[PDB]
Amino acid sequence: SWMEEVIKLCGRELVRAQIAICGMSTW
Amino acid sequence: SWMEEVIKLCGRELVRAQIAICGMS
Amino acid sequence: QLYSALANKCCHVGCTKRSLARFC
Amino acid sequence: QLYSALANKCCHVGCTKRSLARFC
């Protein structure tokens, strides 16, 4: 799974990743 | 505007607010 | 303003929706 | 204290997508 991928991001980029992660994790 | 509203949230609740704010503007 | 400092501020003292909208 | 700490780690050291997924 994509959940094991490691990221190093800050600010807007971190927020956008958070958004996309929760967006992927939904039914 | 709606932007001046104050919030006091942590963790999971902050994240949900953040997501709603970005979907709104 | 690290996003982590704003997240700390929002949880402990409050923040405006405007301050979080800048990180979208 | 938890999300602000995780966002600092993600920005300065790195973090897994699973750590962020816990906050959804």
From chain A, the residues in CB contact with D9 under 8 A are none
The experimental technique behind this entry is: X-ray
The structural domain count of chain B equals: 1
User: Are A2 and D7 inside 8 Å of each other by CB?
Assistant: no
Helix ranges (H only) for chain C are: 3-12, 17-21
Name the burial class of residue C20, with classes exposed (0-12), middle (13-18) and buried (19+) by CB atoms within 10 angstroms of its CB: buried
**Residue written as tokens 């959940």?**
A3
How crowded is residue B25: how many other Cβ atoms within 10 Å of its Cβ?
Answer: 11
User: Are A12 and C2 inside 8 Å of each other by CB?
Assistant: no
> What resolution in Å is listed for this PDB structure?
1.5
User: Are C18 and B11 inside 8 Å of each other by CB?
Assistant: no
**Cα–Cα distance between C18 and B4 in angstroms, integer?**
6
CA distance A19 to chain D (A): 9
Q: Which range of residues forms the domain containing residue B6?
A: 1-25
Instruction: Give the closest residue to D10 by CA, choosing from A26, A18, B15, A1.
Output: A18
Handedness of CA C15, D24, C4, C20 (dihedral sign): negative
